[PDB]
Amino acid sequence: TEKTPDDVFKLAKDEKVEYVDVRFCDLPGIMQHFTIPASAFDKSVFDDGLAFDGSSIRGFQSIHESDMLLLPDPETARIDPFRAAKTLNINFFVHDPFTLEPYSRDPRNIARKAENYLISTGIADTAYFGAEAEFYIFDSVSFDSRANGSFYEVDAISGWWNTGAATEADGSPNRGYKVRHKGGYFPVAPNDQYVDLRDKMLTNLINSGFILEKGHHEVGSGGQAEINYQFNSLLHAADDMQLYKYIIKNTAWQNGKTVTFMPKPLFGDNGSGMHCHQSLWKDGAPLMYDETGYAGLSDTARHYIGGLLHHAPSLLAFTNPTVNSYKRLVPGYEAPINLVYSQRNRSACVRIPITGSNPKAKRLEFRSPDSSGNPYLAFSAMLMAGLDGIKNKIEPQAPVDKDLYELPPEEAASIPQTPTQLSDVIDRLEADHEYLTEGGVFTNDLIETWISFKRENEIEPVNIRPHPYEFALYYDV
Amino acid sequence: TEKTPDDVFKLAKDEKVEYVDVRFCDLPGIMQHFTIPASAFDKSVFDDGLAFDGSSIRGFQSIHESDMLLLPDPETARIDPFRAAKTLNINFFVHDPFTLEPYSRDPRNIARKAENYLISTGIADTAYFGAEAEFYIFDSVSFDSRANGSFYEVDAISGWWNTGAATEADGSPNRGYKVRHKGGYFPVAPNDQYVDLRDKMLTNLINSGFILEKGHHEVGSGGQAEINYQFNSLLHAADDMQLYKYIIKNTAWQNGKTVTFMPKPLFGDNGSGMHCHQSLWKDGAPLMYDETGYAGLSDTARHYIGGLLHHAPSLLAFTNPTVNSYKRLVPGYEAPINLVYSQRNRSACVRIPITGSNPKAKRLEFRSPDSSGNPYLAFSAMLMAGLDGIKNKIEPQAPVDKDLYELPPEEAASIPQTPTQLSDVIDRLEADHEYLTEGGVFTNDLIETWISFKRENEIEPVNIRPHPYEFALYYDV
Amino acid sequence: TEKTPDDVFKLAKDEKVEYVDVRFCDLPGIMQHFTIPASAFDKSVFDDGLAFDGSSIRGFQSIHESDMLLLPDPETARIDPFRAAKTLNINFFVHDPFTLEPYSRDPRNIARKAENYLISTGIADTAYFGAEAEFYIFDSVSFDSRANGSFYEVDAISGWWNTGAATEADGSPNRGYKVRHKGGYFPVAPNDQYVDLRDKMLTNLINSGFILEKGHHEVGSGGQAEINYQFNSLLHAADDMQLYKYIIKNTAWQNGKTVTFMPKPLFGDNGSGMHCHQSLWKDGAPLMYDETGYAGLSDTARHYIGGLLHHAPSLLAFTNPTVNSYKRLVPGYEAPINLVYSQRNRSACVRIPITGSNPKAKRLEFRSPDSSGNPYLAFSAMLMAGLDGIKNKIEPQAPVDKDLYELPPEEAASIPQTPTQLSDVIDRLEADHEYLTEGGVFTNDLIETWISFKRENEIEPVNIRPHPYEFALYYDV
Amino acid sequence: DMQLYKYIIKNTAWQNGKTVTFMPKPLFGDNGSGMHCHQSLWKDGAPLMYDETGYAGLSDTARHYIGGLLHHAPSLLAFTNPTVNSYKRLVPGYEAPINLVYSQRNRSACVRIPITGSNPKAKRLEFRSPDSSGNPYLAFSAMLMAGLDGIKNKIEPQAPVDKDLYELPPEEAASIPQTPTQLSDVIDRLEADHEYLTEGGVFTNDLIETWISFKRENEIEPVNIRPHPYEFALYYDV
């Protein structure tokens, strides 16, 4: 919204930049890259672009459209804090050679089109996303899948399951302070073993332009951690999420650790979710508040929430896209499984943080998502679910500030939950996607590609492989 | 149909029997037991019975019905070939103390009631079952489920995945002959490493009264094996299956091996199924044939087949009752996944073996079942599916002798398959069970108990635990 | 030619036979089996047969022909000397249920049809085959094929490559006598380490009806060995070869060894071949001799030889059917690579043993074949090559008693050799197979099946995998 | 530059505790390593490979050079893909340029004309089939001689395939020529297809005879006489 090309040249110029890392997002959600010498990075890359050698088989920009044009997004230019050779990282939008038309399967293009569509509805001219991604810090991870056996094991020298260890990771003595204490989850050192590592991560984020002003905290619980930062407009909020994951993973890596953002790495500990705060603004002021409406919610907010709860079953195909997502979205660890909004029920898919009569502070929060997917597609899908709700004025059900345990499990069973497996949401998406195709944001092809990838690469592979617990249950049958 | 109490006394008398093993079947399918001295086993046990100390919490004969009466089934009396102290094994029917009424949750009672109901329909007075259960012979099995990891591993010294082993199970040299050859699956020794063990198993079966007359073969393929034997009337065919599994497991056990009847112990090898042949007879002659009908099938047979294919989705809840069942009933190893009958398509749920114009040899075969459950409940459910088809004359679809690959996948997609997960069939049963409750064979309570047990003890436990392959797919997200 | 069903019953009756092993040959050449109780083996099996449960995917008796009928060959009935439970082994011919017509892809049926066709030509009424199969006796074998590496290793405690070993296979001292001596290859003990094992093998062969009358010897050289026995009519000579391999492999197995009949298990030692002697007889007297003809060869013999040399390039597809066959048929170890007949040149594909003026002793010898394939198909293909030569009177080239080294390599280059790779002979067969389809002995389908199997299961798999020597040659490129 | 590049890559890895390989197929189950070569002819200081009237903006100078490449490819590969390992890459998979057709599209085609539009200078052809297992001096020279035999004699190949060869009948897709399958094949194809090489005295018969001798005695025969590990998996039990 403020930075342009020439400024990127000054960042590169002032920093004695040796290399420029060309980044773009693949379908599932991992950033791809190739590097060019800094000397080859000038005005030509911006207006004219760079061709990316027609790669990949199972998807993306084929070969009868052979090459692609990579146009840089100057807002995403950041100095890499890990690479020895001074490098500038920049995200690009993918195009084709016939009419240089933006590739409809580039996740970054879907997010930008979603922002443009917001404008094409007249509702607002800005969608703000403030996602808080949790992660685990481990020391090791190993796994395999063979004909006669399979295993996995994540380990943390100071993990709570290691209280009985004779010696430590380096042969050093077991000094304790591993066991977690019932209930309260954020003890100070030495129970907190990752204080300095989390600080390096936060320092790296702050040096990479992350805004830490309002209620932005650095929190840790055992091996789990979260560093929330200020929101941004849709597309660039998704870019910030990718940058965040990159900084978290590599800070851990350079400090002898290994991080995972998977929804459920531990059976017996908190899952990792991506709690996303949303709101619509216009001309420079809020649109989510009204004291006459519950929790200080405007009629603009209630209907966006209506769309989220109505389309949730299919929305989850982009919001909780993995098989592992459903080990978190299962009975436990108050993971947003209930399809109701409220300032109270945090186990509710949507939570309106207590912000009173302040129109600007008023925001909704879809707590159900996780960080196992594509933030560009997830945020875009969330907007499309909400826009289908505001325009068509979709009315959901009453907010539940009254907790669902003290209540009859008849009216608590009538409280909808989301599907139980990835195969379910992929089916719910296969049938609930008109809101997605509106304004040409998501194409049928893109949705068909996502469904294909998930079934062939995730659902079926896990499904054909016997689970270790099946041996505990059935070897003796 | 021929043996009575006094004969059981002579078997025990002639064999210098020291102990009598009192056996009964639990809900999921494993035989339970307690032993009494042979001297305490007389006419009193038969007409009066034995009380079984009010046990078990999660099910069966509670405590305000406190005790049970165990009446012996003289047809099931067999000398145990494994127990050092000479023992006679006998199966019992479970009862209660108020009116000594047969407990409606005893699997053996469900099977006997099914035989009585066959008679109460007038259709026939005998249901013959000839099931062929496959199994794997291993050398070891280990597995666990922890907070930070999980694994399983089955091993066979001469398993095909061990071609590269430096030495063997006992430090002895790797002598080869492990690799399996593409296509053909029954090579002679030394590729066949279990010749003598299978012979001990067959010798033990023959000594335990198993009839090996017609096309009954002893076959082995790698570590997998099958020893089919002559059919029997429903209840006692289920008793024979339990006896068979007992003899197979313990012959392996006494010979330094470990057997498993689980549907899919190996990812990359044939699954283990329970191919069940069925037929209805009356007064002493067949009822399944007619040359005018396809494959020499009478109109009595076609409708039984109609019921099987119609009720299959729910029938599988008793026929393929485990989570592991669905690793076999998945795309591959021509496991009966297609809901059509035929003399040809073996990947079809039902196969009518080529028996020509012989009314007696004419029989249908439900190849979809596996040995992971309860044979009493599985056979009974199969009969009830077929009886709902004969009486109400349920017409299915045309037999497919023409293989489904060479054909358009439109008409091949219209070819129904069974549900994909255990949770699906449990849902299909929850709604498709009227045929089961007919004649009071299966009670709503029994069906409700089965559904509860499966959801709480199998479906949910596996579902909440991360699969090892999820780490391969998502640790790096 | 002499034994019938009733005699088989007496063999089984006199020997207290517990089991009967039903054997049949698969496409590539390995015997398959299933066992039935001896009590189920009576007159019914002979005239009526046994159905073999419609198995195998990649070939053989499909499923719209679902079942097969197994008719026993009483000439092949032998008592198994290895199986603990007294067993009778018998080979069967494969059939179908529509008109019980012999399956045209059963190797044993191809051999029997070849014998019948010999009669349908009027040329003779008997084809005699006397093949001598060599093999290696090892102590161990291990190998694998992975993404980043591959290996294989055969070992023999007393192998000539182990002269430097500090201790032996069992930790015992290295007692020497391993090194082979230049030239002469059959030293007495202790250089000969397998004297007693070879004797057990010969004793087992003799007890299994193998005729050891004429120049039948038991010979050993290092770990290699050969026990030649008396010839037999085509089909049953192929049955004897299967029995021989079975007895050799299992005698080794029960005595802590492992045998291989592969053409070239060792790089630096003699390959293993199957030198096959042939001849045509009629009414009870010979047809291969004439003093007027070279080496005492009749005009009947010269033309059979003409067919062998003419059709050799394609004949080798059944005669030397593996990729490993071509490590033997390469420059070295005088393996019959030259397409000329002679009493002299043993490196010639055909060798007429010195038998002088004796019409009966006169026989031709195709020394090129190995034991890596199917003897039924190999012998049949040899007959068809020879019959195409006798009938059409195919004239080859002059016999070479004069060795091909002392001679100009111009006239020695004009001396044809056989193709260099399996892919070559499979191509030569794809085009040179009319002699095979004559009289309906080999069907186009059978030949097409063989070509498919070889390309997909052998040629391509080996071809796509980098050879270890490529790393020695090219890692540094 | 190619020799210098390999030297710098290998030794940078070496001084940093690693070991590099340029062999065509070091891994069974991962991408092979190829040497995608872009070519073009220039005169006096300006391009000669472009023309909008011609397909992909190709001049008649370019089409015939491409004609020579596709015509002589079977023998050209003896210098362009000179090792036994070269044929583990040039096998069905990892879109290795196995098809003898040029195109801006089919990358599995031996020749690919990168999208460069109407810019005469940017117009270049790309022989993607080669690998780095041989001699770059001989490989580049052989490529030029294949192309020069095409421009002078005006050798016309076949139509460019921007339409991918999977969606199409495997009859017209089988008529689409591929290169030989083994090193022994290309060495034979060179033994007979080398006049373009001897033109102008660039490659001598002796040099070609030396190459053929070296390959047969030092590479083809040595690998051929040695049993492959997979043969034990397939045949130990025969």
Ligand SMILES: Nc1ncnc2c1ncn2[C@@H]1O[C@H](COP(=O)(O)O)[C@@H](O)[C@H]1O
């Ligand atoms: N319109 C908005 N106004 C203010 N904050 C927002 C808006 N849209 C999204 N947010 C994000 O709400 C997130 C934090 O939640 P919490 O765990 O309650 O501290 C932050 O990441 C915010 O910056």
Ligand SMILES: Nc1ncnc2c1ncn2[C@@H]1O[C@H](COP(=O)(O)O)[C@@H](O)[C@H]1O
């Ligand atoms: N009514 C019946 N008549 C004859 N055999 C039957 C009947 N009902 C069930 N069977 C069983 O069919 C089974 C065998 O199948 P297969 O794998 O084709 O040899 C055996 O276990 C038979 O004994």
Ligand SMILES: Nc1ncnc2c1ncn2[C@@H]1O[C@H](COP(=O)(O)O)[C@@H](O)[C@H]1O
């Ligand atoms: N017609 C025949 N007359 C005599 N021996 C034969 C005939 N056809 C094949 N043979 C076989 O020739 C083989 C032996 O060869 P050798 O290594 O020279 O001792 C033996 O296995 C013979 O029994």
Ligand SMILES: [Mn+2]
């Ligand atoms: Mn939150």
Ligand SMILES: [Mn+2]
């Ligand atoms: Mn069956």
Ligand SMILES: [Mn+2]
């Ligand atoms: Mn010989």
Ligand SMILES: [Mn+2]
């Ligand atoms: Mn390229």
